[PDB]
């Protein structure tokens, strides 16, 4: 799958979880690969699930099930909680600010329509749910990495900090190697 | 426009470009600044066209004013114009019968108050204590200028117990050239400075002040616009307030004044 | 935006107006049509202004084409211009050191594909099977006309295994006068007809058509190149509410290409112009 850019949104999530922390370009490129690789597993699983519906539809519940199949343990439970809340806020400014999210609902909606192999509609709530799940994982990976980088008395998240963040988390480590 | 180059959507593609290709992109950046400079000249020419078309728009606006003020009566052609579009012969005839003529009613009451408050952006700036004041508005006009570059909006008020001014003026001075410090961001004319007008409030009627004497939310704070930096404590938020005040001016000038009766009826939503 | 009927926001206020005030509102309705008629003349003059400015833009657009095709090399003035703005410290210098020159790489590969696909609206019409075709685009140009009124967008393609055409043309014929069917709704030039261009596909390459099966029929398949088979207006028709929104979508995409992407192509190439959803 072609690697889309989320850098600007990854940077906005970062300035929330660590307002004083920067992120190098190379660290930013690993984060983007992480988001892209997770998203493509979500899309592939949602396509397979959509075939078990009448008109092959991908809604917020086809993404929720895919998240439960891809994210292990607490990561799933926390991401499902953040995904439901985002869908509930969106259905109740821009589409993403409507869902309380920094990640791009509009772009991810397009990414879902083009990447998924199902024949039916891709609902907007599936875009909202997907963005909230990618944002949550991003915010979790950034919180751990920014924590690591201040342990080293440096103000920038580098590939070393990301790698320490993920290998210091059983769920995240499993998620990455499975992906 | 993304001001942090590392956040550019295709940064990684750019970064991987061989040096000689990068240098071609640099040439395109340079050509793009020249292109924006010519777009700048286009906007100046559009501005001159708006000035030239004022004589034609003014006649239809002057006639609207006379109708609203009750200074002239509708013609037979004007009366045959449906008050609302998309109405059956039934509905229109029934609409006209719903209320008999009232010779005490002169002109069109609350015309500009209703038109302004039907616009979602301007409605949010009209407080309840502004309503009886805006009811004395007899006309809202706008005119543009070449040197200094910008436009004005004039609010014409009939004699009223709130203030003595007959006309309240709002003036916007605009910049039409790209910022030399950042040419690639130019997306058209930008507000340099907004100048309001001193309101001669009668005793006890200043709805812009309240005793907590502190500033109070009021439409008429439109006439005490926020200062630009040369006349200024917070800068990044004073400039946001200047943009909001400019956007409200544009809505009145570009949208409400040319189509006021469509906001009066509520046909523009 | 412009509503026709009893659905007007202030209908109940209108209904209660005494008849003589209603007749005053009718006069303003008549005057408003005169105002819109003058706006029409204004838009015609702006159209001629855009035509006049084609010659002014032409130099920068031609030089961009020459640079992208590899037909001219950057000057020192061009080389000293930063490839990206807003980079701290050594970042610009390190950016220039990140990948050494490659004399085999001529011009700027995939310039117009990258620019088109980074604009969110046009991105939604570019499918994955369109990408390798748009890689052969060498230039995208636009020209406006007074008689008949409208504009065209032309896509120039190098020799490619997908189709034989060297130029794919999309033409929009516009109406500048207020609509006789609804005078008060006029909000500027409106599309009367969109005319596409016949693509001479090589065997097996037509990604815009697909067959579905007792009977087998050819149906439309999602593809950017459906831009060149636009939907018909009512004058040439034989769903009306859904064909006409599709025409508005096609016109809006044409407007984005002509008004935004073509004049600022390199900013979409870099991705310095971003849209917050």
Swiss-Prot record, chain A:
**Main location per the UniProt record:** nucleus
Which branch of life, at top level? Eukaryota
GO cellular component term, pick one: nucleus
What does the record give as the function of this protein?
Answer: Core component of nucleosome. Nucleosomes wrap and compact DNA into chromatin, limiting DNA accessibility to the cellular machineries which require DNA as a template. Histones thereby play a central role in transcription regulation, DNA repair, DNA replication and chromosomal stability. DNA accessibility is regulated via a complex set of post-translational modifications of histones, also called histone code, and nucleosome remodeling.
KW Nucleus (keyword) present: yes
Question: Where located?
Answer: Nucleus; Chromosome
Note the subunit structure.
The nucleosome is a histone octamer containing two molecules each of H2A, H2B, H3 and H4 assembled in one H3-H4 heterotetramer and two H2A-H2B heterodimers. The octamer wraps approximately 147 bp of DNA.
GO terms (molecular function) for this protein are: DNA binding; protein heterodimerization activity; protein-containing complex binding; structural constituent of chromatin
Similarity comment text for this entry: Belongs to the histone H2B family.
- Describe its PTM? Monoubiquitination of Lys-89 gives a specific tag for epigenetic transcriptional activation and is also prerequisite for histone H3 'Lys-4' and 'Lys-79' methylation.
The entry's protein name is Histone H2B 2
Q: Which UniProt keywords apply?
A: Chromosome, DNA-binding, Glycoprotein, Isopeptide bond, Nucleosome core, Nucleus, Ubl conjugation
The covalently linked position for Glycyl lysine isopeptide (Lys-Gly) (interchain with G-Cter in ubiquitin), per the record, is 89
Report the gene name: his-4
Q: Which residues of the full protein are shown?
A: 31 to 121 of 123
